[PDB]
Amino acid sequence: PITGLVYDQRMMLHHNMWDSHHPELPQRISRIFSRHEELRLLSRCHRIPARLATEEELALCHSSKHISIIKSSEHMKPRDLNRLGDEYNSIFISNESYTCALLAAGSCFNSAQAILTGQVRNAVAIVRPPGHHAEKDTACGFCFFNTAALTARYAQSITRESLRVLIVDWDVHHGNGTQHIFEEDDSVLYISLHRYEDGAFFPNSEDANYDKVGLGKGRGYNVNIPWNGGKMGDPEYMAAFHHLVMPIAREFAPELVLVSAGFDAARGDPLGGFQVTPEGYAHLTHQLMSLAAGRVLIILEGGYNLTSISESMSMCTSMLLGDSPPSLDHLTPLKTSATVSINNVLRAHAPFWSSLR
Ligand SMILES: NCc1ccc(NC(=O)N(CCCCO)Cc2ccc(C(=O)NO)cc2)cc1
Ligand SMILES: [Cl-]
Ligand SMILES: [K+]
Ligand SMILES: [K+]
Ligand SMILES: [Zn+2]
């Protein structure tokens, strides 16, 4: 098989003991995996085994203090789990959360290894809890360790320190943790599309705005594409890819592409409120496959409509397997505010990318 797939039902054991209906559900990953079986995608893929991340691998991006505190939760009494989660913005913790965060990260390291050793061309990782809100020193927004950031540092640790890694973050939320981890880094190009609403959308920081371009040698290697005032869908995401993501990505010439693949911008997602279709995600996937000689690892982030995330991620795997990509309407006019967002990002990044000049 050209396409790898990682999935381990052990990542279901992370659970919310005070709200069993919290939308970051165990069954997010089992529903996506079941859909792969139903569509006969699983048997077309090379199965890659999950493993635990080591504490040494977590230290690629996270402080010893942060690793120690989350690790300390694995044997905590429920009262202590509840108090610990309450130290963070939007975290719940069970005795299994630490192990599950380790399995998500190690599953993606096994997937990046399979790509870079040439065992597979591309790969999908059906993992939880998600990662992109996780900072060097703290948990945030259902995320303990930053799986995608760790995977980029893991890839560099088995090739070269300056291996060009593109991270495309199409989850409807800003990956604040990913941006912060790589803010001063020109080896990892971070591109995020996210609902912003002038800071009313989680995680509610001006850090997500189009003028955050990177710091020092990192100037130009942080691309925020913020959506305001507007139910955004395939036309706006396609336009963002045409005008910003693909020109910048081709100029950067990545050696590995990681997708922070939240499916919470999907039609029917109750937290994202957007209308990206399964064919939209297939189109974005096929665009990214034109990069890095096709070396693309798709990492699950958010996505809360169980049916929508199952169908949407299955259509990404379908594209990685070389199935015929969709032909979508590039002439549909955009929401007026999306044109404004794209022009704001172009203005901010034209100093850094000759492809935008
Ligand atoms: N029980 C139903 C329920 C619970 C929570 C939410 N939404 C939130 O908890 N979040 C948004 C508001 C935070 C406090 O103002 C947190 C959140 C939402 C989405 C994501 C994500 O997928 N990002 O990648 C992360 C954190 C809705 C319904
Ligand atoms: Cl199958
Ligand atoms: K994003
Ligand atoms: K960067
Ligand atoms: Zn999200």
Short account of what is shown:
It is found in: Cell projection, Axon; Cell projection, Dendrite; Cytoplasm, Cytoskeleton, Cilium basal body; Cytoplasm, Cytoskeleton, Microtubule organizing center, Centrosome. The protein has 357 residues and is of the alpha/beta class. The chain is 36% helix and 12% strand.
What does this molecule look like?
α5 (97-116) packs across α6 (147-157), α8 (234-252) packs parallel to α11 and α9 runs parallel beside α10. The chain has an eight-stranded parallel sheet with strand order 2-1-3-8-7-4-5-6, with helices on both faces. The chain has a single domain (1-357), classed as Arginase, Chain A. It is built from eleven helices and eight strands. The chain is 36% helix and 12% strand. The longest helix is centred in the N-terminal third of the chain and has 20 residues, at 97-116. By secondary structure, the protein is α/β, with parallel strands linked by helices. It binds the ligand NCc1ccc(NC(=O)N(CCCCO)Cc2ccc(C(=O)NO)cc2)cc1, chloride ion, potassium ion (2 copies) and zinc ion. One potassium ion (K) is lined by residues 182, 185, 188, 190, 214, 218, 221-222. One potassium ion is lined by residues 182, 185, 188, 190, 214, 218, 221-222.
